Amino acid sequence: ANSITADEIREQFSQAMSAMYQQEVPQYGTLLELVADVNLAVLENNPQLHEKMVNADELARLNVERHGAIRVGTAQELATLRRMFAIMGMYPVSYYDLSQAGVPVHSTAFRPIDDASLARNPFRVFTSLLRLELIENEILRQKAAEILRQRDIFTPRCRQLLEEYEQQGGFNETQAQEFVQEALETFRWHQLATVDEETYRALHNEHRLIADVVCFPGCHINHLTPRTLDIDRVQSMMPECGIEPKILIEGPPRREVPILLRQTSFKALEETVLFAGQKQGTHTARFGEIEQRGVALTPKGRQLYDDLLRNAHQMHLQETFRTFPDSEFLMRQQGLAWFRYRLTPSGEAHRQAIHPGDDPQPLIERGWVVAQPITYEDFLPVSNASREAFEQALGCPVLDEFQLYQEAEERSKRRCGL
Ligand SMILES: [Zn+2]
């Protein structure tokens, strides 16, 4: 029997996940059409752009790219996910301490890390871990904790598969399919709360996120985010399509050369919350999200970005960022971003003239080298004993995304003769 690859399980999962989300949240279906139209147009209106992209095998991924957002309340639950995603070629990258912003959670991003896997299908799932010690009311922290430790979000057949996988160190086609369906069940949405209304209202009142994580079955999808080449255009076309976006657009301001990523949200639906044993229920909001991703920033550039932010309303932002160079040449010159250097047909011809240590600038102007920008695969930084704690819960340290991009850039320099 053939041993199915990770890229194969990941892309099938992503898609299954997407279809389920679509049947759950229709507005998401509409959203996809709108993004497709906008991406097509942007390509139509910019042939060179379309040329650049085709030359860098980055146009295909644009049609399947999405990221998921999920929340869990226990280190245990977080370790199983670490196992489940490993079987799909996704590894925990970086650390985000959303507590630094009031949200009682902290997190990481499970995603592929090799160039080909990213290019083939870059599925990502922002995974957040609840931090009960950040729950004021101790009575509630107590109840939350109780519910969380006595519950189980994975299907038995799903835990069985993680075990079989460990034994064989691989899955077969029939198990790969089954794994995809059983895992999909952990993220499905259910209306039935797993608590009484009184408990729900009390936890919700303490903090919406808390009730979201403790009062519902598995860990339903918070949001599924498709990717676009122009966030502003999408934001403008949404109302025409029945979607009321929200003025705010996080990330840097519109730029010739995008950096990191820009994103915005919107209410995709208000769901009904039910309670076993009674007619009266309540409701909760499922928010949709959209993003546009630019070049990955260097430690020096991420620092510039953070400082500039720490200095600033969208007009004031744009004003502030005039400081951040807005041309690949300038950004490359000051070591602000990550580029993938590739030889040009002309360049490979003269390959024997390119030597290690050489300055790429001359070779680029000569037409021999091209600096492709490396896409940002991670998330926006949120404006210690927490990281290590989180790493303890996870079961391993989180990868340093800067080290990832650097290696990728270095890898390409070798491939070129540097
Ligand atoms: Zn997100």
Q: Can you read off the two tokens belonging to residue 399?
A: 């990868």
83 is in an annotated binding site: no
Centroid of ligand 1 to alpha carbon of 98 (angstroms): 13
CA distance 141 to 158: 29
Ligand 1 mean position, distance from CA 69 (Å)? 6
Both structure tokens of 312:
């600033």
**Cβ proximity of 203 and 214 under 8 Å:** yes
Distance 103 CA to ligand 1 centre (A): 14
Instruction: List alpha helices for 334-386, DSSP H.
Output: 345-349, 360-365
Half-sphere exposure of 139 (CA within 13 A, CB side): 4
Centre of ligand 1 to C-alpha 148, Å, is 24
**For residue 306, which phi and psi values (nearest 5 degrees)?**
-60, -45
Give the Cβ contact number of residue 283 at 10 Å.
Answer: 11
Contact 134, 207 (CB under 8 A): no
The rounded distance, in Å, linking the Cα atoms of 165 and 9 is: 13
In order, the DSSP letters of 188-255 are ---SB-SS-HHHHHHHHHH-HHHHHHHSSSS---SEEEEB-S-HHHHHHHTGGGT----S--BSS---
289 marked ligand binding residue: yes
Instruction: Give residue 272's identity as a one-letter amino acid code.
Output: T
Residue type, 373: P
Give CA angle at 285 (242, 247), nearest 5°.
50
223 is in an annotated binding site: yes
Residues spanned by the domain of 348: 1-418
Tokens at residue 1, please? Answer: 């029997």
Q: What is the whole-number distance in angstroms between the Cα of residue 382 and the centre of ligand 1? A: 12
Task: List, as ranges, residues with CB under 5 A of the ion ligand 1.
Answer: 69
Are residues 25 and 269 in contact, defined by beta-carbon separation less than 8 angstroms?
yes
* Cβ neighbours for 267, distance < 8 A, ≥ 6 positions apart: 244, 285, 286, 287, 288
User: What's the rounded Cα separation, in Å, for the pair 4 and 390?
Assistant: 31
CA of 316 to the centre of ligand 1 (A): 25
What spacing in Å lies between the alpha carbon of 375 and ligand 1's midpoint? 17
Q: Which amino acid is at 90?
A: M
- Breaks (C–N over 2.5 Å) after residues, the chain: 312, 383
Q: Write the CA distances from 57 to 115, 372, 375, integer angstroms.
A: 11, 11, 12
Q: How many CB atoms lie within 10 A of CB 104?
A: 21
Q: According to the entry, how was the structure determined?
A: X-ray
Cβ 192 vs Cβ 224: under 8 Å: no
CA of 125 to the centre of ligand 1 (A): 8
| Kind and range of the H or E run holding 177 | helix 173-187
List residues bridging with 270 in a β-sheet. 285
Q: 66 near 263, Cβ under 8 Å?
A: no
Domain count, the chain: 1
Place of tokens 């360049």: 347
Distance CA 178, CA 171 (A): 10
Q: Dig out the tokens for 140 from the structure.
A: 């509630």
Alpha helices, H only, 25-113:
27-44, 47-55, 75-86
229 neighbors 62 (Cβ within 8 angstroms): yes
User: 357: Cβ–Cβ under 8 A, 6 or more apart, which residues?
Assistant: 418
User: Considering only CA atoms, which of 385, 408, 395, 418 is closest in space to residue 74?
Assistant: 395
CA distance to 31, 56, 65, 293, 370, per residue, from 60 (Å): 19, 10, 9, 15, 20
* Residue 265 phi, psi dihedral angles, 5° rounding: -125, 180
> Kind and range of the H or E element at 286?
strand 278-293
Q: How far is the CA of 224 from the centre of ligand 1 (A)?
A: 7
Tell me the torsion sign for CA atoms 38, 40, 41, 42.
Answer: positive
- For ligand 1, the distance from its centroid to the CA atom of residue 126, given in whole angstroms, is 7
Cα of 277 vs centre of ligand 1, distance in Å, is: 35
Tell me the CATH number at 165.
3.10.180.80
Beta-strand relationship, 105-111 and 91-96: antiparallel
Rounded Cα distance, 201 and 189, in Å:
20
**Strand extents, DSSP E, 6-142:** 66-72, 91-96, 105-111, 124-130
Crossing angle of helices 197-206 and 138-149, in 10° steps, is 120
Question: Cβ distance 42 to 230 under 8 Å?
Answer: yes
Within 8 A by CB and 6+ apart from 93, the residues are 108, 109, 110, 111, 113, 377, 378, 398, 399, 401, 404
Return the closest-CA partner of residue 161 out of 174, 152, 151.
174
d(CA 393, CA 395): 6
In this structure, which amino acid lies at residue 297?
L
Instruction: Measure the CA–CA gap between 88 and 16, rounded to whole angstroms.
Output: 14
This structure's resolution (Å) is 2.6
Q: Is there a contact between 110 and 91 (Cβ–Cβ < 8 Å)? A: yes
